[PDB]
Amino acid sequence: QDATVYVGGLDEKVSEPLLWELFLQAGPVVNTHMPKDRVTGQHQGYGFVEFLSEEDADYAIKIMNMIKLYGKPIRVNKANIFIGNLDPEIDEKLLYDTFSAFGVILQTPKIMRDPDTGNSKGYAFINFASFDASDAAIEAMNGQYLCNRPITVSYAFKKD
Amino acid sequence: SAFDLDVVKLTAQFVARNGRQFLTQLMQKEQRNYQFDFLRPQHSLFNYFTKLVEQYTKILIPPKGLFSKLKKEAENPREVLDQVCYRVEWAKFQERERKKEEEEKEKERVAYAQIDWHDFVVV
Amino acid sequence: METILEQQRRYHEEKERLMDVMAKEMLTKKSTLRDQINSDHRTRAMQDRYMEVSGNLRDLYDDKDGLRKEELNAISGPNEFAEFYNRLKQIKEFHRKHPNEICVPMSVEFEELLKARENPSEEAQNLVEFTDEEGYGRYLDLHDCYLKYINLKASEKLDYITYLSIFDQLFDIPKERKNAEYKRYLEMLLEYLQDYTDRVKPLQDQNELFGKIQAEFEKKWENGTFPGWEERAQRLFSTKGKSLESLDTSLFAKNPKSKGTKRDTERNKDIAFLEAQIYEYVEILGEQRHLTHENVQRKQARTGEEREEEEEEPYWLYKLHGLNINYNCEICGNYTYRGPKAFQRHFAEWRHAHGMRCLGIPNTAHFANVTQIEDAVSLWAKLKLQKASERWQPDTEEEYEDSSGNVVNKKTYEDLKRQGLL
Ligand SMILES: [Zn+2]
């Protein structure tokens, strides 16, 4: 897990030897793994590249971070408001700093991860201090231009 | 982080003995080729340096132990218990004020989510 | 050292942290009497520590009056500051962050969820200062005092209710003589009552209460504290009456009243002070004595069981595929494996690799179908010897001929050549 780098944000043009060919300049990528879905039978955008040394994986994570690969925000990492279609290049501290401009955050946010890879699932949950920050996130942040990924902010629970 | 904290404590001790706002022992040190990034207010350590300077100024008070001796806080446990009870009452009043502010914010959010947003009038 | 600047601010921060801990202890609600007594003892210990810190900080003002002339001088300044900065310009290779400058006194004055006790008060216990019969200040133990009174009176006609009725009197006639041996038991009963009063309220000022009791004993009890309408003025030491105040003032400095008797003011002053302290403890803790008397009456009126309850509170595949034949491996915790297809595969599985790492021998194809420990270590010794032999080791295998003689001595190894060329 230390020598392997988890890549997120892969489109349909990216393939299993294509990621190994793109990561060959960063370091000696020994193997590439792409988990296939059960309903569609294709990649879900997240994969893994197992290299030989941890320094090559660190250089690939520091070089290929927030890159625009196949029209997709590909990024390598070390393997009541709901935000969907978020970029995997952002972290919890980056999401807390991005959410601090609209309103005040009550605590540190959390992002959902896949049970197989564990880098990024695609959705996240963040809680605001009051309902005014949630309304400002649903008015402004729900549709704002993020890092090559159109996010969507919505309410997790609402009572009619 | 011990050397930076010691430098901040030395700057707070040297700045508290000044007779003016700008005529201090640290303003002339900035022009004497001494790098001090904690003097600018843009850094996060400046908020702690200001609290250290405030504590150094409060350590120079006449009831702080320079020319007088405290008798109520040092020789009366009942006065300390009354001060602790007053601090607990002030904390309870602050918690009640925060709960009232949260209730007012919830009432404003309930009133804003129930008003009609289709009756537009441009005058 | 900045004793007037840094040490005074540190003492003020410690006093503020102690006051914040006391306010957090007083703001929290209580549910039990023993936990409340432990919190009161911790608050009293924190108040004593804050008073000691304030007394230590209040004495650091002798050199401050001499150093204030040099500290407030605007002619000085950045010279000594630059000298201190050059003294603080040492090697910064100690890459270690210390966030416990103010967080450590905040954590020392706090408690945990498993045990509600502070870090200086971690060794404090309520069972070392109070007995089980007292109930952490709920009642008072009077069985030993009643046994001592029955041993001193030499009679079995005094029960616990009679002793409680005799001990309830404050200014009435005593049960025995004042010059008898009952004063030695009364002094012990007063010394126990003083400790019971000091244990029932640790947050109260015991020294101020003792000084007030001494002032009331000296200024009031020694000057006729019980006026009448021999009955006009009574003396506690001499145990005699007086006609008027002038006769009592003339007899207060008399020769039998000073030292010419066995109950004078010279020898029987401590017994009178102990009796006054016992009367003050009975007047201040009368509700606890009434609760102890009610508990004794409820224990006497109860039965044996009530007193005990109060004191206690395809079978064919089975053999075709290889099952029913089990194999065990010592390298794997004597884990017994099933039919051969699984047993042969186990050497590659996780558990066997774990078991082999215990000895320090890698998992390879050589160590397959080997289940015993000593066999594994012997085969590892063999393989080690073989491989280490068949490698090319230049250090011991090489022929150098140093230029020391330059025409002789070709038996030099690769290490002696460096030693000769050094
Ligand atoms: Zn085994």
Author numbering:
A (entry chain 4): 11 to 89, 101 to 181
B (entry chain A): 160 to 282
C (entry chain C): 1 to 229, 279 to 362, 393 to 501
Lines from the paper:
Among the five snRNPs, the U2 snRNP plays essential roles during the recognition of the intron and assembly of prespliceosome. The 17S U2 is regarded as the functional form of human U2 snRNP that directly participates in early spliceosome assembly. Three RNA helicases – DDX42, DDX46 and DHX15 – are found to be associated with human U2 snRNP, but their roles and mechanisms in U2 snRNP and spliceosome assembly are insufficiently understood. Here we report the cryo-electron microscopy (cryo-EM) structures of the DDX42-SF3b complex and a putative assembly precursor of 17S U2 snRNP that contains DDX42 (DDX42-U2 complex).
After 2D and 3D classifications, 430,443 particles yielded a final reconstruction of human DDX42-U2 complex at an average resolution of 2.7 Å. Compared to 17S U2, the conformations of SF3b, SF3a and the U2 snRNA in the DDX42-U2 complex are nearly identical. Our DDX42-U2 complex likely represents an intermediate state in which DDX42 has fulfilled its function but is yet to be released. Compared to DDX42-SF3b complex, the N-terminal sequences of DDX42, including the N-plug and helices α−3/α−2/α−1, remain bound to SF3B1, but the helicase domain has been displaced from the C-terminus of SF3B1HEAT. Structural overlay of DDX42-SF3b with DDX42-U2 reveals overlapping positions between the helicase domain of DDX42 and BSL of the U2 snRNA. In addition, the helicase domain of DDX42 also overlaps with the Linker domain of TAT-SF1, which contributes to maintaining the BSL conformation.
